[PDB]
């Protein structure tokens, strides 16, 4: 099973992310025009609504009704993919295998939005009021609706 | 249940289409910058893949494995929404109630693509080799991935 998203937003950041699944989902692709040598929050948001740009994507995809965390944490939203790393050229070469994402069933991310943020995800580990909501990762630099691919 | 798509392409045509369902799906919205006083083919295509613009959307969404027809015809693809009409200003005010579309289940269009074409859909009623495939409606002026909305 395959899905894909084309990310764009109110910023120069752009990329293409693929999702494949036989089991874990493999997330891959390149996101460009980001800050160099950085860590940036990467999350599946609930709605595939791009009518108000990335803002209409809503909160993190959270079908289990829990709080925000790192991708590897015990407590995390299904949509929490942690921070991705950019190189000196501002490119994030995304490569993630995640067992909470799915492309089928009740936890499917098809028709939702993948978002790359302007800041680092704080992993739900601060006293900031957005920490347990979103990781306080700042603006949504780019996003794309997750669609079924061939 | 609600879904939404933002349509853009390699043309000036742009719009926002909503889909609502309790039963039939109601399709509504405005598509702008089209030719004036025209009829233009409007279809759900199989893939929500915008990585090669509208071209990567693939063929008409066709889970029942049949041939192309008008929205009201006996023989039609599930994705066949016929022609929409534009006014003198090049605006299509889309308003359709369709019983073959769905936002849930095996025939769900979530994560697929809605496409507006540059030409009239021939309704599967000509000898053109694309008639039974697509209605020979010409270029894909704009398209959008269909996402879950609030
Ligand atoms: Cu986010
Ligand atoms: Cu078409
Ligand atoms: Zn989260
Ligand atoms: Zn068709």
Rounded CA separation B122/A43 (Å): 43
Active-site residue, from B71, B76, B77, B112: B77
Tokens of B50: 């915008």
Tell me the chain A residues in contact with residue B144 when contact means C-beta distances shorter than 8 Å: 50, 145
Q: Structure solved using which method?
A: X-ray
Q: Are A4 and B51 spatial neighbours (Cβ–Cβ below 8 Å)? A: yes
The alpha carbon of B115 and the centre of ligand 2 are apart by a number of angstroms equal to 6
User: Which structural domains are found in chain A, ordered by start?
Assistant: 1-150 (2.60.40.200)
Q: Are A11 and A119 spatial neighbours (Cβ–Cβ below 8 Å)? A: no
> Does the annotation mark B68 as catalytic?
yes
- The 3 state secondary structure assigned to chain A is CEEEEEEECCCCCEEEEEEEECCCEEEEEEEECCCCCCEEEEEEECCCCCEEEEHHHCCECCCCCCCCCCCCCCCCCCCEEEEEEECCCCCEEEEEEECCCECCCCCECCCCEEEEECCCCCCCCCCCCCHHHHCCCCCEEEEEECEEEC
Confirm or deny that A77 is annotated as ligand binding. yes
For chain A, the residues whose C-beta falls within 8 A of a C-beta of chain B are: 3-4, 6, 16, 46-51, 58, 110-113, 144-150
Rounded CA separation A83/B23 (Å): 42
Which ligand gives the minimal distance to the CA of B140? 2
Q: Give burial (CB, 10 Å; 0-12/13-18/19+) of B22.
A: exposed
Which ligand gives the minimal distance to the CA of B62? 4
Rounded CA separation B127/A128 (Å): 65
> Residue A71: left (phi > 0), alpha (psi -120 to 50), or beta?
alpha
| CA dihedral over A69, A71, A74, A75, signed as positive or negative | positive
| CA dihedral over A86, A23, A7, A9, signed as positive or negative | negative
The alpha carbon of B127 and the centre of ligand 1 are apart by a number of angstroms equal to 51
Rounded CA separation B27/B143 (Å): 15
> Residue A145: left (phi > 0), alpha (psi -120 to 50), or beta?
beta
> What is the Cα B43 distance to its own chain's centre?
2
> What is the Cα B39 distance to its own chain's centre?
13
Active-site residue, from B40, B76, B112, B117: B117
Q: Are B42 and B85 spatial neighbours (Cβ–Cβ below 8 Å)? A: no
The alpha carbon of B89 and the centre of ligand 3 are apart by a number of angstroms equal to 44
Closest CA to A12 of A39, A32, A27, A26: A32
Across the interface, which of A48, A147, A150 has its CB nearest the CB of B50? Answer: A147
Nearest-Cα distance to chain B for A25, in Å, is 17
Which ligand gives the minimal distance to the CA of A118? 1
Nearest-Cα distance to chain B for A77, in Å, is 18
Nearest-Cα distance to chain A for B107, in Å, is 13
Q: Note whether A48 contacts B3, CB cutoff 8 Å.
A: yes
Torsion of CA B106, B108, B110, B116, to 10 degrees: 130
């Amino acid at each position: 099973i395959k899905a894909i998203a084309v990310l764009k937003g109110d910023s120069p950041v752009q990329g293409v992310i693929t999702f494949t699944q036989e089991g874990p989902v493999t997330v891959s692709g390149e996101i460009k025009n980001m800050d160099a040598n950085a860590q940036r929050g990467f999350h599946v948001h609930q709605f595939g609504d791009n009518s108000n740009g990335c803002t209409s994507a809503g909160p993190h995809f959270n079908p289990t009704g829990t709080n925000h965390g790192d991708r590897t944490a015990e407590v995390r939203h299904v949509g929490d993919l942690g921070n991705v790393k950019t190189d000196a050229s501002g490119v994030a070469k995304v490569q993630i295998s995640d067992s909470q994402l799915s492309l089928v069933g009740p936890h499917s991310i098809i028709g939702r939005t993948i978002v790359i943020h302007a800041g680092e995800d704080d992993l739900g580990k601060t006293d900031h009021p957005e920490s347990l909501k979103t990781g306080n990762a700042g603006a949504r630099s780019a996003c794309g609706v997750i669609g079924i691919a061939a």
